[PDB]
């Protein structure tokens, strides 16, 4: 549902390649993206399901 859910995905400044989920409001689903390990924002989920439960419907 929310407004952090509309925010584009943020990799940030750390250089890990960790696969996370974000809500893609344009698609109406959660998608994967590369999170570099630090300073995550709130559209950043560890599994599709966590993403769907928090955001799905935004």
């Amino acid at each position: 549902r929310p407004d952090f859910c509309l925010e584009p995905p943020y990799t940030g400044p750390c250089k890990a390649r960790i696969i996370r989920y974000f809500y893609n409001a344009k698609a109406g689903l959660c998608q994967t993206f590369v999170y570099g390990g630090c300073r995550a924002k709130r559209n950043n989920f560890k599994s599709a399901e966590d993403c769907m439960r928090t955001c799905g419907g935004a």
Partner: protein
């Protein structure tokens, strides 16, 4: 000119891949049971791979060993990235050979303009995406503190240094974190953070490993 080159198979024998189903970070072998990496590389269910070149095919030199323990520095700051260092104890000792070999810790800190090797399976495109199968290497000099602090005002602690080229196009990127910066055989840094990758006036930031040597040796000894 692109920065990276393909190191060549098993030429950086202290480089390890951190795997949780896929390569997410690098690290360095410090002895047959301990790996050093970045704190922001902390995950559950780490498998360490040793003896890799192609991280996508099994080339017969590998040792895949699980971690038993992961110790992030007590004073790791998630916000400021200060003390971005972590030790990983292997479930069982590696067998050290010619493709799998550990890197010596420093006796002193390196000066600005020391040229180092930085190695990784991270993204090879500055703006773009392309993760290599084989391991890449980059020679990059240590930068002065004063320039580092000009590149990133307010953000550089005594536990960080900058390395690379103010011009850009040659850096470390996503995928490369936790992996080595080795200068004249000694492990000086850990791949840590930056403003993007390979952008002008923003060289990479690396954990200053010479500050932690007492902490490493004592944490290794008592765990």
């Amino acid at each position: 000119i692109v920065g990276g080159y393909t190191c060549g198979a098993n030429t950086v024998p202290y480089q390890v891949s951190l795997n949780s189903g896929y390569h997410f970070c690098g690290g360095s072998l410090i002895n047959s049971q301990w790996v050093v990496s970045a704190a922001h590389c902390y995950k559950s269910g780490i498998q360490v791979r040793l003896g890799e070149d192609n991280i996508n095919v099994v080339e017969g030199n590998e040792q895949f060993i699980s971690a038993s323990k992961s110790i992030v520095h007590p004073s790791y700051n998630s916000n400021t990235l200060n003390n971005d260092i972590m030790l990983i104890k292997l479930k069982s000792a590696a067998s050290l050979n010619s493709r799998v070999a550990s890197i010596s810790l420093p006796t002193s800190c390196a000066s600005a303009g020391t040229q180092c090797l930085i190695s990784g399976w991270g993204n090879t495109k500055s703006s773009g995406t392309s993760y290599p199968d084989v391991l890449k290497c980059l020679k990059a000099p240590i930068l002065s503190d004063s320039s580092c602090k000009s590149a990133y005002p307010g953000q550089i602690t005594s536990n960080m240094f900058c390395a690379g080229y103010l011009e850009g196009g040659k850096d470390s990127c996503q995928g490369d974190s936790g992996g080595p910066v080795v200068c004249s055989g000694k492990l000086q840094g850990i791949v840590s953070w930056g403003s993007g990758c390979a952008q002008k006036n923003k060289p990479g930031v690396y954990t200053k490993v010479c500050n932690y040597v007492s902490w490493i040796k004592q944490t290794i000894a008592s765990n």
